[PDB]
Amino acid sequence: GREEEILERARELRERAEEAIRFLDENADEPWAAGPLGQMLRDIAEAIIRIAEAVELLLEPPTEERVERALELIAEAWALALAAILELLLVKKVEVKRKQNGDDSPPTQEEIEAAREEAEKMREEFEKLLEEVKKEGPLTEVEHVLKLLEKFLKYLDKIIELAEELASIDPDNELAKNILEAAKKLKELFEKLIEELKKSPEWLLVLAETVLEAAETLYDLIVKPALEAYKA
């Protein structure tokens, strides 16, 4: 059962992300979990939880109300994840540049807030796109979803470019390599998805399957490795 199978992936993905958040809380006293890196991993893990919960709405009896609310939750959750990934790159860029120059001291609060505010602007611009597309019509129309996915592709290009430059500044930085590899995979997944939605009669399931795979990629390549690096 394709739909039974999607519901199973969503619940398993949800449980893995919750284990991640429990890991960060049980380690709240440690400095890395309190800092910006830990909070961004939490945000990504929370975004994965929300994506999984929203997919479960899709796999219900179809209705204009639930499906559209489900599409907005998927869109806003990916908006959170891409913004958290962006802020993570921005904070690590400042960390690496400083520690290379010297000043082992952690990045200043102003540097951190500057990165948080840039990520936040990306999150707000997506919300404005969502609100304007919705007045044009419901997101249950394929063209409207494609408009949101193309915007995700734009943000993902920005992440890729920025992760490329961290990897040039710090060639041996595993977090930058993982974000770069995850961002490249998400771009391939979302481009193939834009191709398919036009010709797919059951496009909600195709969208459901793709966002689960994309969220699984965030968990497997970004979240879980960074946590395991701190256990050891």
Author numbering: 1 to 232
Task: Quote the study's own text.
Here we use a robust deep learning pipeline to design complex folds and soluble analogues of integral membrane proteins. Unique membrane topologies, such as those from G-protein-coupled receptors, are not found in the soluble proteome, and we demonstrate that their structural features can be recapitulated in solution. Biophysical analyses demonstrate the high thermal stability of the designs, and experimental structures show remarkable design accuracy. The soluble analogues were functionalized with native structural motifs, as a proof of concept for bringing membrane protein functions to the soluble proteome, potentially enabling new approaches in drug discovery.
The core topology of GPCRs comprises seven transmembrane helices that facilitate numerous non-local interactions, enabling them to bind to a variety of ligands, including photoreceptors, odours, pheromones, hormones and neurotransmitters. We tested 56 designs, of which 36 were expressed to be soluble, and we selected the ten most highly expressed designs for further biochemical characterization. Of these ten designs, nine were monodisperse monomers in solution, and all showed the characteristic circular dichroism signature of α-helix-rich proteins. Last, the designed GLFs preserved the canonical seven-helical bundle characteristic of native GPCRs. Structurally, the crystal structures were in very good agreement with the design models, with r.m.s.d.Cα values of 1.05 Å and 0.88 Å for GLF_18 and GLF_32, respectively. At the structural level, we observed that the irregular local structure of the terminal helix was preserved, whereas the intracellular segment of the GPCR fold exhibited notable structural deviation in GLF_18.
